[PDB]
Design a binder for this molecule. Structure first.
Ligand SMILES: *[C@@H]1O[C@H](CO[C@@H]2O[C@@H](C)[C@@H](O)[C@@H](O)[C@@H]2O)[C@@H](O[C@@H]2O[C@H](CO)[C@@H](O)[C@H](O)[C@H]2NC(C)=O)[C@H](O)[C@H]1NC(C)=O
Ligand SMILES: *[C@@H]1O[C@H](CO)[C@@H](O[C@@H]2O[C@H](CO)[C@@H](O)[C@H](O)[C@H]2NC(C)=O)[C@H](O)[C@H]1NC(C)=O
Ligand SMILES: *[C@@H]1O[C@H](CO)[C@@H](O)[C@H](O)[C@H]1NC(C)=O
Ligand SMILES: *[C@@H]1O[C@H](CO)[C@@H](O)[C@H](O)[C@H]1NC(C)=O
Ligand SMILES: *[C@@H]1O[C@H](CO)[C@@H](O)[C@H](O)[C@H]1NC(C)=O
Ligand SMILES: *[C@@H]1O[C@H](CO)[C@@H](O)[C@H](O)[C@H]1NC(C)=O
Length: 650
């Protein structure tokens, strides 16, 4: 009863409602032009069928009454458009609609009744990122035989789902279902079993309580289950294994699940992602499920209570790239056969466990290892020299263990090493010379070991070193002034060693300088206002004001005066030099350290008066001038007077 006689009129009725066309999509929407050539419109057989204005950024106050007469419209894609629209307007759409994408389209209001049960030709429904407050319509699942894809994710939908009746005969096409990002409450419905062809079910980021239903085992075709970030409790039901003929992604993280990991997951030979992290899962880890996970790429178990020996069957996971056991009760040792079994292992994380034993040298045979974290365990032995074969290793983290021996010189073969964190171990010896071929190292932490020798001068050739922590060792000698060549060092910790001599004038990143290690660090470049910036042989605002920010030198045997070049480290915030043998006056340049916040110069032998330049230290919240030989009227301007008097004793 209509033709383009009515369709072309309908499309231009929409242009009237539009009050802003940022990209001018509706520019060619003219009655002199046919709707078949209208931007974003498609016809089949002469009548309008599709109208795609998604992402166009259109802005208006629109109503869907300008589509009703379009009784040939099968696709309606108006996603990502800044126009207001009432939720009841869904009922004014053509019943010939099959696809419907209204993501971030500006819908407001509770979902209307008699829409999902009315539009019985919709196969795909995406109404995500709107404001459908309130509950779901009772008719949501009553007559949707052909609905395959229902995405109502990321609204403010509240209320329960266990009230919705789901007839077996009306949820037969449903494969993709996404209600994530809402405030839906109550127990997970046992009725979702009736959607027998579910392949993807996502209910993450809601307020579901109660247990994972045993009925979910009946979703034989399920490939992807995400119940994460809810309040689900209880044991992971073993029936879930009855979906293992299809399951590829299982996400139960951020709930409060107790009990053991079900052994039935040993049949999930197609599993690719397993995230049980951030629960209270406990009990002996069933090693046998790992022998079936030949296709597993991601294993997230962190932040649980999982006990038992660290699983030795992890060598069967030939596809595993990420293995995260952080914060569990794993005992035993690191399996020596982990490698080359886990041939694609890239991140091995098991900090905060009860794992003992040595680091197996075979771990060098996991060729793809990028990150190793073994901290807060009970490991012994020595760092195997074979560790230098992990050419792709960027993090070796193993602080708070009982590792002994010397630092193997083979570490210099790690050209990609960026973080070497070994503090609170029992490493002895001198820092090997070959260690300094790690030119890309950014964070070195040797705190609280038994290292001896002197701080090597070759710490200056490391142009990317940002944090250096050597505190509480048996280092001797003088502070190498080469440390002042580091163009990026901003944190220096040498406290509690047997270091003598003076304090070098310039240390760490100096005013100016930049991380760049090529031509852009020199000045051979030229400005030519075919170029603009050329390398003729013979910028960096803000960053040229960066310098050391944390300098702890306390509890050593240093002598001499405090240099006045330390006043040029404007970005300094913490300056702890207490318990040395320093003398002389306090430089007036200290007042230039505006952002200084901590100044611990106790148990030295300083003399003179305190410069009133300290008044400019607006951010000084802690000072400590105990056990010195100072004298004079303490500058009352600033915070120095607001600080306690015990910081000026003796
Ligand atoms: C590194 O330590 C292991 C730790 O083994 C046991 O576990 C600890 C929690 C603690 O109770 C230790 O005293 C235990 O020994 C040592 O492994 C033992 O090694 C001895 C031989 O020296 C052997 O007879 C034990 O059976 C081993 N125990 C095991 C495997 O549980 C290991 O010797 C230590 N390595 C080094 C190089 O000192
Ligand atoms: C289930 O829903 C979420 C909703 O966001 C999907 O998106 C990812 O989920 C994480 C969970 O922390 C969000 O923070 C991220 O924004 C999303 N990450 C991406 C797209 O990489 C999530 O993927 C869905 N899960 C499954 C198994 O389909
Ligand atoms: C599935 O639907 C049938 C009718 O189609 C109904 O009898 C049954 O109770 C439903 N199952 C649920 C709600 O778990
Ligand atoms: C989670 O389970 C643990 C272990 O049984 C329990 O102590 C805790 O109270 C639970 N937390 C919540 C938030 O339900
Ligand atoms: C176990 O429940 C406690 C209860 O407070 C919660 O803090 C914690 O997240 C859960 N366990 C872990 C390991 O996260
Ligand atoms: C880095 O230094 C070590 C020791 O001198 C050497 O074996 C290694 O080959 C050097 N660099 C590279 C890229 O191999």
């Amino acid at each position: 009863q209509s033709s383009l006689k009515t369709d072309s009129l309908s499309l231009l009725s929409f242009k009237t409602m539009i009050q802003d066309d940022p990209n001018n999509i509706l520019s060619n929407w003219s009655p002199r032009k046919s709707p078949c050539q209208f931007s974003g419109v498609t016809c089949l057989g002469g009548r309008v069928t599709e109208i795609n204005l998604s992402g166009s950024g259109l802005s208006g106050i629109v109503s869907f009454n300008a589509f009703t007469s379009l009784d040939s419209l099968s696709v309606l894609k108006l996603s990502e458009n800044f126009f207001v629209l009432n939720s009841t307007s869904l009922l004014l759409l053509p019943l010939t609609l099959t696809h419907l994408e209204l993501s971030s389209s500006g819908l407001i209001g509770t979902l209307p009744e008699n829409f999902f049960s009315k539009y019985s030709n919709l196969i795909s429904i995406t109404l995500s990122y709107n404001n459908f407050t309130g509950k779901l319509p009772n008719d949501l699942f009553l007559s949707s035989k052909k609905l395959q894809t229902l995405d109502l994710s990321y609204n403010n939908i509240t209320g329960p789902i266990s009230g919705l009746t789901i007839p077996l005969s009306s949820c037969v096409s449903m494969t993709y279902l996404d209600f994530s990002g809402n405030s839906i409450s109550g127990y997970i419905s046992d009725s979702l079993i009736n959607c027998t062809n579910l392949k993807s079910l996502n209910l993450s980021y809601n307020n579901f309580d109660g247990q994972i239903p045993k009925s979910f085992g009946e979703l034989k075709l399920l490939q992807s289950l995400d119940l994460s970030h809810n309040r689900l409790t209880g044991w992971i039901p073993p029936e879930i294994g009855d979906t293992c003929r299809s399951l590829q992604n299982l996400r139960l993280s951020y709930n409060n699940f107790t009990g053991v990991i079900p052994e039935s997951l040993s049949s999930c030979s197609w599993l690719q992602s397993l995230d049980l992290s951030n629960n209270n899962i406990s009990g002996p880890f069933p090693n046998t499920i790992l022998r079936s996970f030949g296709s597993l790429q991601i294993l997230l178990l962190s932040n649980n209570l999982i006990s038992g020996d660290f699983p030795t069957s992890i060598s069967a996971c030939k596809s595993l790239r990420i293995a995260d056991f952080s914060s569990n009760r794993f005992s035993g040792v690191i399996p020596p056969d982990l490698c080359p079994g886990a041939a694609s292992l890239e991140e091995l994380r098991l900090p905060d466990n009860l794992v003992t034993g040595e680091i197996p040298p075979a771990i060098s045979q996991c060729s793809e290892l990028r990150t190793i974290d073994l901290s807060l365990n009970y490991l012994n032995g020595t760092i195997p020299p074979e560790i230098g074969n992990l050419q792709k290793l960027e993090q070796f983290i193993a602080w708070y263990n009982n590792i002994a021996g010397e630092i193997p010189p083979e570490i210099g073969k790690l050209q990609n090493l960026k973080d070497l964190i070994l503090n609170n171990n029992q490493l002895t010896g001198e820092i090997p010379p070959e260690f300094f071929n790690c030119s890309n190292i950014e964070w070195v932490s040797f705190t609280s070991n038994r290292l001896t020798g002197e701080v090597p001068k070759d710490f200056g050739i490391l142009s990317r070193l940002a944090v250096l922590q050597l505190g509480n060792n048996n280092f001797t000698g003088e502070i190498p002034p080469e440390l002042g060549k580091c163009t990026t060092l901003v944190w220096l910790d040498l406290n509690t060693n047997h270091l003598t001599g003076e304090i070098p004038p310039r240390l760490g990143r100096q005013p100016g300088s930049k991380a760049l290690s090529g031509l852009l660090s020199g000045n051979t470049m030229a400005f030519v206002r075919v170029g603009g910036l050329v390398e003729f042989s013979g910028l960096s605002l803000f960053t040229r004001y960066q310098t050391i920010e944390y300098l702890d030198l306390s509890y050593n045997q240093l002598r001499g005066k405090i240099p006045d070049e330390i006043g040029e480290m404007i970005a300094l915030q913490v300056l702890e030099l207490s318990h040395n043998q320093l003398s002389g006056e306090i430089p007036f340049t200290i007042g230039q350290l505006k952002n200084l916040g901590v100044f611990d110069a106790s148990d030295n032998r300083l003399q003179g008066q305190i410069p009133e330049s300290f008044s400019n230290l607006s951010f000084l919240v802690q000072i400590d001038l105990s056990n010195n030989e100072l004298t004079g009227p303490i500058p009352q301007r600033g915070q120095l007077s607001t600080l306690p008097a015990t910081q000026y004793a003796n």
